């Protein structure tokens, strides 16, 4: 037996992979792979063989590939006995006697033509294939990779990567058909002695019915399958809860999640996100405003329902104007411990400047680490249309000049609160980054009740039976002076192409 | 070929198996492990052998096992023809012929007794041993089990279980002797490939010398493990870089530990931590103390260095008292925004109680997802001996009344610092379910900047270099009807084991 494999490039949703005659792109990084892989092998005395179409042999220079040995697929073209390292059959099938002799090649790439991937697929030759998925999807294409044979998983994806602004993913189908037991059995055995008694139990590994593409056991790399797996795991052990809002909710206590932000930017692709209402919303922060309506305005309603006269009422705070929400977040971040009359006042030179003394201690002294930015303040909470979710951040200058972030959230709406939530504090900390010299670095957000409200439950089902799409990116058209300068119109969404809107409703 | 594993149960420390024929103690979840293990089996038509020295014949009441076949090694008992479940050997080499025939017997377990389970490991015969750890040292016995020959290697270790306040492991040791490649390959050349822009990079799996107990790769399951591998994870990635102090300490940002309470209190094991000093501050806070003097007098030496009048000076306080440390937590735990005068004022009916709504609230209101207590209080920090470390918490009511915990915490310490903010904070929650009528639940704690002083390395090595044993039980001996009313002399810690202390300076 010998090991066959396809190579190749596709665009995310169509799939396209050439363009006459020439790649639809220009991606280094991944030609390095492809070297890297087509490549790698272990008998030094032995070459990978890469069986190529002749249109991509000519577009390939019709000169040899180092350390290997190209075969072209061609009717015409002539058996050439000059060069030792490229040779000619005359189809597919026949080609494929490299493991039939020729005990010199170790493994077989085949690598690549639309006519020459749909044939090596269609005859079964393939038993993995290492996928390359370019976020760029809005260009003509005459050249298309097939559609991946059922009978093919996907067992890996890695992070999403970035060169040019164009995102990037790189994961390797394989074809199945078909640490010891000592301690699974072990564990098993303990597991059902002790019960709920033993942690292991109190946190279950979720069921394949509810896991997002389960067939990815131990290479989920992109970092959505940080959100992706929490959203399946309290789907799995989230014990069912009544709560203020009046839709219970399914909630485990003390999750965490990860997302890289120097080569893409965590806006989840396995539903389309209301960016621009999380942005809105998030300089309304910056800005340290607390008028409802100054979102109404910009069509962002996401503060309509704990704001409205009727749960002002309710709440206590009928006092309110219509759309009044206190010292919430921002007046919180821009006046800590300012006495609040209404959102009308001029709040200007009156408590705390977070933000400010943030930037400052950002730039002035790096490796402090005093770099928080709090919206607790017990003495307001009653006064607040609701309290603090993203409860306290903090700030970490690395040595490479990146500015990573940390938040803490007490109560975090999976379904509803959290997309917002990943993406408002990923732009937050570039633009923090961007207005004191430094760029992305990671974020980490640390829930303590994670939850799903009941009512979220057949739609973050559906959420979970997409395959996540490379993450974007995100760009500032122009470096501003002051951070509470950003506009909309400052931003660039580069190579987002989410699964469609799943509505959902919320609980007031 | 043929299974051979060895189940035993011993003291944690002098291995104590035997007393007057007798268990030293009687714990019925561990023998129903035994049970569990030694029944065990594949083949619905075949049992396993158990093989023990007639002195534990003689103590498991000469009657068969269910479901088993014992085999008792003997040089007087009779060869008895009348029970089919049961059969004498003159030797134990002799017996294992089990194996040289008797395809009836597909496993095989040597239930041991001082004198077999020597003999039965001198010869090389047994191939696995699962081992009960028993928390339990200062009884006097009289057959111990021998010392695991170097040949055998821990791969398992549970967590703590607790049984009428005895503590103990279940770990498995086996002998040594002699994923999928695509994907640790294709991870490994987009290592290559991508450099440190591939977040992977960035978080680096520790190496083995810096590991603790390597040979427990997938079944690490004690909860010491949750710090320790954060320890070797620093020393791994831990970028070097200077602070507030002359000492230097290497660093990487947002990690986690998390720790069952529910069974056991993870006081560290690996070395023996001042668990006086954890509990006079903890009592201390909750007081709302500020007057570093009062740990002093109860000879607890930590908040000396940032107490000193030369150091208060040092920060712009010197118009303080020699200990006079300001609002810091306790302060801002039952005095949020109260105005700080000296430490010796009457604050009582000043500020913010945090401490008493927070009990308030968890008793009247549970599954209110506002269980808060911060001490970060950005007016403050300025007339502060030093900012709030263990910045905010949040607590949890489990359906089945359990108080579980979380911590953010700012910047810690993993050398002196940690150590105290796990258990003080175990503890503070044990304390709050008392006094709510809960029981413990789990803690969670979020660090943020986690660091070592680079004058601890030579120690954490050491540290590092321990196999980690049970962790001990806590429990109050009253019922305090006020949680201030707490006091040393109410806990009691029981089985504690820990290795010798290890000598470590405090960075002022
Ligand atoms: N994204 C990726 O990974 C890759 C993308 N591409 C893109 O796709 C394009 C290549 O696709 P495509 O144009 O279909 O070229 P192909 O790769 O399909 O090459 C097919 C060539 O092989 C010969 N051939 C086809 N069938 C047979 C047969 N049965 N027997 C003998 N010879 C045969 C043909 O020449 P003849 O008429 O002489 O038989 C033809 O020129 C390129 O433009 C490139 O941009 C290419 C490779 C990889
Ligand atoms: N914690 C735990 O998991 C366990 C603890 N224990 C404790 O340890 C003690 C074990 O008893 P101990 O006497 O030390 O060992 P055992 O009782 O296991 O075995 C000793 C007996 O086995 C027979 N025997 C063993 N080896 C030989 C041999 N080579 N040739 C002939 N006969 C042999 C002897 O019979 P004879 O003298 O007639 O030749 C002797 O009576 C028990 O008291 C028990 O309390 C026991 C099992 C498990
Ligand atoms: C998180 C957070 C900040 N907030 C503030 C906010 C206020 C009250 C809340 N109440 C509850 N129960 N859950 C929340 O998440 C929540 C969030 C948000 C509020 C609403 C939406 C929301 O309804 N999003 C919808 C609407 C999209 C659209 O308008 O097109 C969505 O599909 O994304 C998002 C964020
Ligand atoms: C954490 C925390 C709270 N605190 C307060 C506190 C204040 C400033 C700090 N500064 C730094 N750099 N690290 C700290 O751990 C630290 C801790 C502690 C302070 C000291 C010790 C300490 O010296 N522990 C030694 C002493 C043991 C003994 O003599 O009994 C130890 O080995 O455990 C522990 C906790
Ligand atoms: N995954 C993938 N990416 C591609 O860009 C790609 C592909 N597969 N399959 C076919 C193809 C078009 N044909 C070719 C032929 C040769 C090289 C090439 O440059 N090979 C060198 C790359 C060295 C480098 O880029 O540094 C090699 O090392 O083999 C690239 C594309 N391009
Ligand atoms: N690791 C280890 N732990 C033990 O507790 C232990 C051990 N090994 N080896 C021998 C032993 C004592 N042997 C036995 C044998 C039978 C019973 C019994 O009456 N019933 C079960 C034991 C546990 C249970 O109650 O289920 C049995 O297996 O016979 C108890 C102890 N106990
Ligand atoms: O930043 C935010 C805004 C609010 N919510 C969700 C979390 C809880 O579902 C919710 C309800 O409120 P509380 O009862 O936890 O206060 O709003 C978020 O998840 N994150
Ligand atoms: O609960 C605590 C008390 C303080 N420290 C340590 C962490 C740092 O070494 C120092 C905090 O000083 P800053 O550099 O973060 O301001 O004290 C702890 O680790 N944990």
Redesign the interface.
Known sequence: EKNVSIVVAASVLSSGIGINGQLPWSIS?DL??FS??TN?KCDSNKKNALIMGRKTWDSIGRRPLKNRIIVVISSSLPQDEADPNVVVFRNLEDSIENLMNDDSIENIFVCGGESIYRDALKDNFVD?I?LTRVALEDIEFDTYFPEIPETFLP??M??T?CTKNISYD?M?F?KQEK??K??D???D??G???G?????N?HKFPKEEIYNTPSIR??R?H?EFQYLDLLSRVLENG??????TGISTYSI??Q?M?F?M??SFPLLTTKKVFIRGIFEELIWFIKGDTNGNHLIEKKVYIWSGNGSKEYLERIGLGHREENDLGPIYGFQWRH??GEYKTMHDDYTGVG?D?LA?LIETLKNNP????H?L?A????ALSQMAL?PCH??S?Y?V???NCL?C?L?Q??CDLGLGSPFNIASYAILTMMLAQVCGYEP??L?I?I??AHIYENHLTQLKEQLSRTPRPFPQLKFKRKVENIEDFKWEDIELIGYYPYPTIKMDMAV
């Open positions: 990084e390095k792979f890297k892989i790698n993995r290492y067992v890996y890695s992070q990567f790189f390797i394989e640490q010891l000592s301690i059995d072990t564990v055995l303990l059902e002695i002790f709920i008694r033993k942690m292991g109190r131990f290479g790399e970092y014990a069912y809860r009544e709560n203020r206590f003390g965490m990860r890289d120097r080569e800590y411990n705390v977070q003394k490796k402090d680490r005093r928080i709090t607790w303040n017990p003495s309290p409860v306290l903090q970490y690395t040595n490479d990573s940390n803490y007490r109560s670095g990671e980490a640390f303590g009740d």
